């Protein structure tokens, strides 16, 4: 009831910014420095709520388990009042978080990003300037900020160790660090270097070519005509428009005194500024094609032009399926009303996505309802199709704003996450699927999507990846017991394995490779009782009693599986989910998660608990194999001569003294060897202290000595070789190599 969202007066659907500001208002009101009451106590609860809700891992964990997983310090009032959330109230500054960063600065737009550390002398020298700078260049490029304080990994990985650091980004080119003085005019001059601001002087000679070339590419021309003693667009205005309209409209000018025959031909003797759409025609008799402008100001002219540019082409429903599967499309689904009417800036998507070969289109669901229905589109939505032969798409769940949409379209179309539903769900598929059950209103769900996309590309051909919108497909989510968002699940031949590791390609792949060849038995109370408690014969068990809300358990799980792979045919490896079987684990005295236990041969202790410091695969494996009893046969002079020398099978033999230190050090490794090669080679030990005769005959000079005996079936004979290696795995491979060359 005292939920962290409730404590900040905020909903579970709150953005990072909404959480930050919510915390800030409470922090300023409940801070110690402003209250002799109590203070610290009330302030420590909201600070705990913030510290958890601001962390990507902790918030997703909190959403899934609440407080049970989270295990257990602040700044001055001054800090929260002046230095905290420093750009949250500056609309021109786009704040970027770790997982949305790469998609943003690789969108295709020009980005100038302030990597800063929050503080008094850090920023605030810069912050006011950075705010004014964003206003000045608004419309020409994106101004970003990254709080390295909250995204240390992101700053570290980008090689940013000192603050502030200023970088220009643009897809297709390397990042450019700015080292100049951080005045507004210097920042501006630096950024303008990277803006595309081409203004063409048009003339009688190049006019027709410039127009036709542009028109064929579907691009119009903004042209100002200058003559003596007439006002026209100044060079600075011309440059402004050039950058503002980059890829949309070419900016140019004509000197009419120098280009008389051109200005006569166009019948524009005076000073005019005109926009020429593709298809436009201008002469003394025809002027309706052209849009003449009255302003001399860049923004006033831009606003008029961007509104007059044509809307996206309306996609015919007749084409779909065939057209949708073979081409890249960015589709604005609408229901009668064009929902994009209030934002002409979206028209820039055409030119920005030209190199991605995406056609940006509108589709009217009121003209073919069945089409939108079978796509499970019920409200206006945005979808980008991959067009590689099949109809594959993702739905945009970000802000309905240009830079966010663009970032999504490019990232999604170049990755391999697809949208699932009841009709295409891999409930019983041959190839393995990774399915992400989520809600669009969930900020950790949305945040996961870039990771998922990245992994989808790296794992192409090995793992298929899809998302399922539980907000729409409630029946499917219930069926698979989805209790929180996001929940990622691997479907392997209708087997279901929830995945709670990091969503990087390498760890997902390792997790999947274990699934194909299981190493750990997932044990139930019923099946633990039958396989472990009622274990028979020569069989031992290692069991990890874990809980999914436990952090050290989550760390152990991949190590535990790594270990189990190396223990094939040596030790049985199991695991128990103590969240699911809480009562059972209570009866088994599991007082900590994770609990690791070894179960020896029945034939006197119940089990042994692991109490080592390190819980990596190698040290857990060594601990377990150390419990195993002797596998090698203790030979006598009688049996050594009878069963080895006069035998018909292959042997490895350890000649040793029980007092020899090296003999004792090698003893466990020999027993490991015996179990490894068991089935092809018998193993024996010879106590040279007890039987000096036999070791004398064998010619043993040093303890321990290892002999390999191979039976030549064709010649009914055993021949002997010395083994000098003392590494079990090494010896085993060596022996096996020899056995192939024996048949």
Domain boundaries, given as residue ranges, for the chain: 2-85, 86-194, 195-310, 311-415, 416-517, 518-628, 629-743
Tell me how far apart the alpha carbons of residues 664 and 685 are, in angstroms, rounded to a whole number. Answer: 12
Question: With contact defined as beta carbons under 8 Å apart, do 520 and 573 qualify?
Answer: yes
Residues whose CB falls within 8 Å of the CB of residue 287, separated by 6 or more in sequence, listed in order: 267
Torsion, Cα 645 648 651 653, to 10 degrees, reads: -20
Nearest to 119 by CA among 127, 129, 111, 108: 127
Tell me how far apart the alpha carbons of residues 110 and 94 are, in angstroms, rounded to a whole number. Answer: 13
Q: Can you name the residues that pair with 295 across neighbouring β-strands?
A: none
User: How much helix, strand and coil, in percent to the nearest 5, is found in the chain?
Assistant: 40, 20, 40
Structure tokens at 527: 């099946």
Q: Can you name the residues that pair with 593 across neighbouring β-strands?
A: none
Tell me how far apart the alpha carbons of residues 27 and 42 are, in angstroms, rounded to a whole number. Answer: 10
Residues whose CB falls within 8 Å of the CB of residue 730, separated by 6 or more in sequence, listed in order: none
Structure tokens at 556: 């152990």
Question: For 629-743, CATH number?
Answer: 3.40.30.10
Architecture of the structural domain at 86-194: 3-Layer(aba) Sandwich (3.40)
Q: Can you name the residues that pair with 249 across neighbouring β-strands?
A: 220
Overall size of the chain counted in residues? 743
Q: Do 86-194 and 416-517 agree at the fold level?
A: yes
Tell me how far apart the alpha carbons of residues 383 and 377 are, in angstroms, rounded to a whole number. Answer: 10
Question: For 416-517, CATH number?
Answer: 3.40.30.10
Tell me how far apart the alpha carbons of residues 562 and 556 are, in angstroms, rounded to a whole number. Answer: 10
The alpha-helical segments, DSSP class H, found in 414-473 are 443-458
Q: Is 533 helix (H, G, I), strand (E, B) or coil?
A: helix
Indicate which technique resolved this structure. Answer: X-ray
Sheet holding 521-522, edge to edge: 521-522, 572-577, 541-546, 595-599, 608-609
Nearest to 132 by CA among 177, 79, 93, 84: 93
Nearest to 485 by CA among 465, 472, 469, 509: 469
Q: What homologous superfamily is domain 311-415 in, according to CATH? A: Glutaredoxin (3.40.30.10)
List the resolution, Å: 2.4
Question: With contact defined as beta carbons under 8 Å apart, do 272 and 223 qualify?
Answer: no
User: Per-residue b/e over 47-86, b at no fewer than 16 CB within 10 Å?
Assistant: bbbbebbeebeebbbbbbbeeebbeeebeebeebeebbbb
The gap between the terminal CA atoms of the chain, to the nearest Å, is 73
Residues whose CB falls within 8 Å of the CB of residue 130, separated by 6 or more in sequence, listed in order: 87, 93, 114, 123, 143, 145
DSSP letters, 83-103, are TTTTTTT-TTEEE--HHHHHH
Tell me how far apart the alpha carbons of residues 336 and 364 are, in angstroms, rounded to a whole number. Answer: 6
Burial of 633 (0-12, 13-18, 19+ CB in 10 A): middle
Nearest to 417 by CA among 393, 399, 437: 393
Tell me how far apart the alpha carbons of residues 700 and 704 are, in angstroms, rounded to a whole number. Answer: 9
Question: With contact defined as beta carbons under 8 Å apart, do 572 and 522 qualify?
Answer: no
Nearest to 459 by CA among 490, 428, 494: 490
Nearest to 309 by CA among 350, 344, 333: 344
Residues whose CB falls within 8 Å of the CB of residue 25, separated by 6 or more in sequence, listed in order: none
**CATH number for the 195-310 domain, one of 3.60.110.10, 3.40.30.10, 3.30.300.30, 3.20.20.105?**
3.40.30.10
Q: Is 498 helix (H, G, I), strand (E, B) or coil?
A: strand
Residue 642 DSSP code: I
Sheet holding 273-276, edge to edge: 199-202, 249-255, 220-226, 273-276, 291-293
Q: What homologous superfamily is domain 518-628 in, according to CATH? A: Glutaredoxin (3.40.30.10)
Question: With contact defined as beta carbons under 8 Å apart, do 93 and 130 qualify?
Answer: yes
Residue 161 DSSP code: -
Nearest to 563 by CA among 579, 575, 580, 550: 575
The alpha-helical segments, DSSP class H, found in 176-248 are 184-192, 207-216, 235-244
């Amino acid at each position: 009831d005292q939920n962290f969202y409730s404590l900040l007066g905020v909903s579970k659907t709150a953005s990072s910014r909404e959480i930050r500001q919510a915390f800030k208002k409470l922090a300023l009101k409940l801070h110690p420095d402003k209250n002799p009451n109590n203070a610290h106590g009330d302030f420590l609860k909201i600070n705990r709520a913030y510290e958890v809700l601001k962390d990507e891992d902790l918030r997703k964990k909190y959403d899934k388990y609440g407080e049970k997983g989270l295990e257990d310090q602040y700044e001055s009032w001054s800090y929260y009042r002046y230095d905290f959330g420093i750009y949250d109230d500056d609309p021109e500054i786009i704040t970027l978080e770790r997982r949305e960063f790469d998609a943003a600065v690789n969108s295709g737009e020009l980005w100038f990003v302030n990597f800063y550390s929050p503080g008094s002398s850090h920023s605030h020298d810069l912050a006011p300037t950075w705010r004014e700078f964003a206003k000045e260049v608004d419309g020409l490029l994106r101004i970003g900020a990254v709080n390295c304080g909250d995204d240390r990994m992101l700053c570290r990985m980008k090689g940013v160790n000192s603050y502030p650091s200023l970088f220009i980004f643009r897809s297709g080119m390397a990042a450019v660090k700015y080292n100049g003085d951080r005045s507004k005019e210097s920042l501006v001059a630096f950024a303008m270097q990277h803006v595309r601001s081409t203004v063409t002087e048009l003339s009688t000679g190049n006019f027709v070519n410039a127009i036709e070339t542009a028109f064929a590419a579907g691009v119009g021309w903004l042209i100002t005509f200058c003559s003596k003693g007439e006002d026209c667009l100044t060079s600075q205005t011309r440059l402004r428009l050039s950058g503002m309209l980059d890829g949309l409209v070419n900016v140019g000018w004509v000197d009419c005194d120098a280009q008389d025959s051109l200005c006569k031909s166009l019948d524009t003797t005076a000073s005019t500024t005109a926009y020429f759409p593709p298809g436009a025609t201008l002469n003394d008799r025809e002027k309706s094609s052209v849009l003449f402008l009255n302003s001399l100001d860049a923004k006033e002219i831009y606003m008029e032009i961007i509104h007059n540019l044509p809307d996206f082409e309306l996609l015919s429903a007749n084409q779909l399926e065939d057209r949708l599967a073979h081409h890249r499309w960015l589709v604005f689904f609408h229901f009668g009303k064009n929902e994009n009417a209030n934002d002409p800036e979206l028209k820039k998507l055409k030119t920005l996505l030209k190199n991605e070969h995406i056609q940006v289109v509108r589709f009217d669901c009121s003209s073919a309802p069945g089409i939108c229905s079978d796509l499970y589109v019920f409200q206006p939505s945005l979808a980008v199709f991959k067009g590689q032969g099949t109809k594959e798409y993702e739905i945009h769940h970000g802000k309905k704003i240009l830079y966010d949409i663009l970032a999504f379209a490019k990232e999604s179309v170049n990755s391999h996450v697809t949208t699932l539903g009841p009709q295409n769900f891999p409930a019983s598929d041959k190839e393995p699927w990774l399915v992400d059950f989520f809600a669009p209103w969930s900020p950790p769900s949305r945040a996961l999507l870039p990771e998922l996309r990245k992994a989808s590309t790296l794992l192409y051909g090995q793992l298929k990846v899809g998302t399922l919108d539980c907000t729409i497909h409630e029946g499917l989510c219930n069926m698979y017991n989805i209790q929180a968002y996001p929940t990622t699940v691997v479907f392997n031949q209708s087997s279901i394995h929830e995945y709670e590791g990091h969503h990087s390609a390498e760890q997902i792949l390792e997790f999947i490779e274990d699934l194909r060849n299981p190493s750990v038995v997932s044990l139930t109370p019923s099946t633990f009782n039958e396989l472990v408690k009622q274990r028979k014969h020569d069989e031992v068990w290692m069991v990890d009693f874990y809980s999914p809300w436990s952090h050290p358990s989550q760390v152990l799980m991949p190590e535990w599986k790594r270990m189990a792979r190396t223990l094939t045919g040596l030790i049985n490896v199991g695991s128990v989910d103590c969240q699911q079987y809480h009562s059972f684990c209570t009866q088994e005295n599991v007082q900590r998660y994770p609990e690791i236990r070894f179960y020896p041969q029945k034939s006197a202790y119940q089990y042994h608990s692991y109490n080592g410091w390190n819980r990596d695969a190698y040290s857990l494996r060594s601990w377990g194999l150390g419990f195993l009893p002797q596998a090698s046969i203790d030979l006598t002079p009688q049996t050594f001569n009878e069963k080895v020398l006069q035998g018909k099978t292959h042997w490895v033999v350890d000649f040793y003294a029980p007092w020899s230190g090296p003999s004792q050090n090698f003893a466990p490794e020999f027993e490991l060897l015996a179990r490894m090669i068991k089935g092809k080679v018998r193993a024996g030990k010879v106590d040279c202290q007890a039987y000096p005769q036999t070791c004398q005959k064998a010619g043993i000079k040093a303890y321990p000595s290892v002999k390999l005996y191979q039976y030549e079936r064709a010649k009914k004979s055993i021949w002997e070789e010395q083994i000098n290696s003392r590494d079990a795995k090494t010896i085993a491979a060596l022996i096996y190599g020899k056995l192939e060359t024996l048949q």
